[PDB]
Design a protein around this ligand. Structure first.
Ligand SMILES: O=C(O)c1ccccc1C(=O)O
Ligand SMILES: O=C(O)c1ccccc1C(=O)O
Ligand SMILES: O=C(O)c1ccccc1C(=O)O
Ligand SMILES: O=C(O)c1ccccc1C(=O)O
Ligand SMILES: O=C(O)c1ccccc1C(=O)O
Ligand SMILES: O=C(O)c1ccccc1C(=O)O
Lengths: 267, 267, 267, 267, 267, 267
């Protein structure tokens, strides 16, 4: 199975790429005027160790900029530029009008660097959490970059982690606020179940068995314990995991370092 | 002078907020349905030391969700949640319908956490270079998060750094590419000048004082070097600061850690 | 609990209303020009028996046209315009500039008529199956009107039916296609699970208890048949209701009759 | 002449198709991930008697999903699946990546089923109204589905009826409200004529000859009688038509039943 | 009757204003940052003789920038900044935050200057033809500024001219092309009528009374000639006005001079 | 260097063209229905003396309308139709479906006529201002047509003039308002420099040397004198230029006459 097949042949994600280009060229591209449209060739280099992610998104940038791209690595490949190659590894070869290449450059790399960065941070964490014997799952959160949720969630998947619920319409998540308001957790879950129906899971954030009792009771599919159903623990920082089904943490995607890339024309 | 005044009373940045809300509620807000619309109070907490930023953007989120907000610190205030008596500082008091607070919560926090992160990274870096006699200035780059350029460049400013050119339409930045293409740094600058006009500057990435001077006479406004005019050094990070007018780095905005925030109802 | 609370205070659904107004006034509103802006009163009448629905959507239309509205019945009220003394029931009192009322009129009525239609069809069908001992539940499908999914699924809910998965991102629904492709119901479910994660369910359309069980063990959350887990029957309409957890049909929302409404000024 | 030539080679109607796809895939298409991109072949079946409509719109769905379509029937063709063929008739053959076919499926059928449904209801009515000897015209209304006016009006045309005015900017339509406000029908029409000019027709809703007098008087092009100019009668229910030029009725498009379709991959 | 009532309370024209503000502030408004938000007063001056137009559009700009405006003249007032005591007439008093006034200034002026220009050119031309016994009417064309059709056609109306058909969907206008294609003016009109229906007119560009009459009998509503029905002459400009129902010219709206305006703070 | 290379291979300017087409065809294109899709050929004529401008924009109209265009003149070419050729000169040959040609016609010409019109007015002015011995620069303003700034600024460049700052985010421009508010011009420029940074120029509108003193003082890059730095004079009307670096005037783009064009199918 190929991860890039998660993206619909057409949809709003492609218009996003268009909007990212417009963000970079509000009026005219002066540099492209001087460099002209002569056919050039360029190398796209990875300059740091990590997992390659965000290929389909970057590919869409190149398509709209009408360039031809030859990827030398599949998405998900671990790159090690430090051994040494002048510090870099070419992961793609670009061909097309000079101005088009230089126009597509910044946006494409800004995509790859962050996407690869999240996959690398994602993989590092689950790998590290799984090396302790913990066979549960490591998940993200909804603490994504505004307007970039599609790409960031996608990067979590390639990094090997669970994306968790995508948004507020995906899985009901009731925490203390919701419960106080409906009153009973069995009522909170009752109402939640009334609208979300059977096709969506309901998770409840509990403190004591009491809550996690009526919660399991009412029919909640997931119980979060904070401090025929699943258990979750939100926080995951360091050193330990203990047979809980899910440990959620924004560390795999929010505020993670980026994986540097560069693009240089042949001559 | 107030930074938020940099943002136009109306414009695309506000629709951005709207699209960020849509990103999180593609269809229904089940949690909002259970929680209902009773008036509530909530505290917005800063959970980590750093410079507060993203206030007007978080405020626009609160406005669209029809809430009332009381900010306790001006934007740019160096927060220090050190007192551990809680390790948090209430940065704002929020009031409104229960479902509205919970709907605005994630989106607003994702804004504040990242904006404050960048403001912080930008401030600790410009001061870090300030504590070495360097009296020039630190600048950003175009390596910003796709679709979030306006917010990130805004953070850099509050952070104390120079944002540098905003996009591919805000300066001309010519490299070897544009010089090889035009024939000479003078031909490239002549061309760039032919389109950008007197109102916009032109920067040339010279790699020799020999050419740098023909660039300086070609009409350039800024001269760059890297591994009647300004001078810049572009690249990496440590130790090294000659008296160059500007030093740019994506370190003040790209791949920076975020500043933890949270929101809790009074109950 | 109030259904309209399912809709976010702000989001794409409100721009939808705006685009619906544009659809009706591409350029000028001549009738509005003749009628002017004198304050007027109007009665919104229900002309046929059925469950009232589409109130928050009609209300958003009235808000954008800057009108004041007084609703006489809660959403979901079974209206019966039988008294013929008029055969109509005033469902709302509207006041505002004459041109504003007439501009909002068609759009708001088209909303109410269709939303009430679906709520009605959905209610008479779920009860129709309820009066045969069946205590499971009736669900909708993805066979919704293009661009009107949010409104139609909303109607189903008020109507008393389960809306079923919202889109191609809200459950995984695997068929022979996905099984042939992956090799086994278990391979398909393993793959679906690899991307949707723990937060979202997976339904497999088994056509044999032999496989249905490998689907049930593969990790499925729902098992479908058609001409620790739930069970569904998908298809047609009459007479027949075994104790299957769910029965889906596009009959509750697609091709349903509408519920006649009208609006008249006081004069 | 070909009906599909009414749609501009490019325009907002194509972006609508894109928006309908996004409505179905807010985030990821999990099913498409498992089924992969293997080239498949599929049959598009009509499962109910009626007129085939909405071809260009469905074709646009397939283009954006990058599929190849072979239509075995021209738009407007009467299909009779009941005789018998296993109940179905293949009207199109689809070829393309498996995931693309399955992605395009739901939206394309949701289009065809409703479009064909309106054309069939439209044709049935005029045919039935014309079999009484009435040689006038049968027209629709503005009681269309919000956001789907282009397709629904189009379906009326293929069904053989008149679409009537497209929107509030097409033809002025003054009913009692408008007249009371300008005062005289000759004034109401006077003002209306002042802005709409000569390129657009003015229709007035009358009660007594008096109104339909000054109406014809002032220069109204169409007179609606409700209960060098044209006459209209809005309501048309059943059994009779009497030499009036136009009988308008929402029965040909609003709340009509749908014509079922299905799509199944070859193997 | 008030012209501004031609514009719907809400619709795409208001988003247009918003996009016009974005066009002018792609990122930040530095000038707004220096000037701050102190309440100020300003005078909007008309600097050249002509008919005032574009008031509701300028007002929408002032609304979005959260300002209060006091208009001194009704739209359509023939302004004459002749008194030279100043050569200007205060057309409106504006109050609000300093940055808001300065942000709204250019956009609002560009609106007023062009709208007033067209209203003026349209008025001096229709009267110019009026002072030659001609009692028919002057009309516009489709040769409008891209993206500004609504504003320009609006100006024509206030200017006193007929706007003519609004777009390619508001009349059918058939030429030799459509006749050659269909075979006869009658076949073309029959086809046009088959799709536009009774509600919309059909104009045929006849170049012979011989055909003009078959067009007139084919069902045409308007007959055009150029270098139970109306008659039009399309083309140029001078001296010549037979008793033809309509004379169209792009002179009343395309390539017209603008009417100078300015805005100044009280200080 | 080619001017059309200033436009990004993809960006919002292409969506604008799409929006201009939709503005012309809100619903159906009746004329295109009758004329059908037969392959035709057409000539695009220039009917007035002037400079050809707006080629890339017009080309984009033809691409979206799927036509093939053969340009017989490069953008910037001076056309002289008066000598005589029947008054016209073919500058492009169009080939494609009849309906597509007729659909693209109006929008393409509305573009060319205005663009060529601005370039011609632009060239005429600088040429005339440069024939006096003045070797400074002639610039435009921000008094552009709302929503058409990209094309109008572009036309100024081809006409030979300077576009001046593109928008409110391009170059800071402080006039009396701004100065009064910050107080000192050295403070006004100080604050301005605080946010705009080094990459953007600051221009100050002065009255007396005093202002133009502290202005040069604080570090203002351009001084406008109204009545290592540049001088500007805004107003330029007629007869004289005196060794100032820049004379700005909206005369080169606002309210300029248009250069007529026409398109006629071969037969
Ligand atoms: O963002 C959060 O608060 C969050 C935190 C942990 C897991 C899941 C979520 C979620 O909301 O989906
Ligand atoms: O984006 C970059 O690579 C960049 C890096 C350093 C300074 C400026 C820029 C810029 O292009 O604006
Ligand atoms: O859309 C369908 O064909 C469908 C039919 C019945 C249940 C669910 C669905 C669904 O796909 O969500
Ligand atoms: O929708 C209506 O009220 C209506 C009803 C009958 C004919 C035409 C119309 C119309 O408005 O165009
Ligand atoms: O656009 C034109 O060429 C035109 C010219 C004169 C009248 C009407 C029109 C029109 O097409 O609407
Ligand atoms: O539009 C103006 O006021 C203006 C006038 C002259 C030069 C420049 C400008 C500008 O704002 O950019």
């Amino acid at each position: 199975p190929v991860y890039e097949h998660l993206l619909p042949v057409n949809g709003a994600w492609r218009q996003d790429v268009t909007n990212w280009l417009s963000e970079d060229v509000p009026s005219f591209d002066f540099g492209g005027y001087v460099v002209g449209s002569d056919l050039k060739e360029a190398n796209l280099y990875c300059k740091q160790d990590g997992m390659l992610c965000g290929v389909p998104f970057a590919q869409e940038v190149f398509n709209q900029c009408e360039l031809q791209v030859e990827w030398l690595f599949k998405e998900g490949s671990f790159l090690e530029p430090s051994k040494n190659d002048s510090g870099k590894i070419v992961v793609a070869k670009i061909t097309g009008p000079a101005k088009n290449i230089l126009l597509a450059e910044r946006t494409a790399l800004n995509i790859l660097s962050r996407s690869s960065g999240i996959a690398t941070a994602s993989h590092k964490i689950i790998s590290l959490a799984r090396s302790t014997g913990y066979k549960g799952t490591i998940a993200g959160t909804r603490k994504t970059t505004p307007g970039l949720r599609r790409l960031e969630k996608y990067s979590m998947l390639v990094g090997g982690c669970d994306t968790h619920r995508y948004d507020l319409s995906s899985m009901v998540m009731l925490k203390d606020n919701h419960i106080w308001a409906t009153g009973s957790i069995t009522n909170a879950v009752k109402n939640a179940r009334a609208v979300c129906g059977f096709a969506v899971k309901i998770e409840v954030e509990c403190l004591s068995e009491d809550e996690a009792t009526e919660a399991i009771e009412a029919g909640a599919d997931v119980i979060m314990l904070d401090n025929h159903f699943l258990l979750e623990c939100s926080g995951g920082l360091n050193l330990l995991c203990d047979d809980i089904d899910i440990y959620s943490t924004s560390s795999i995607h929010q505020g993670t370092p980026v994986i540097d890339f560069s693009l240089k024309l042949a001559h």
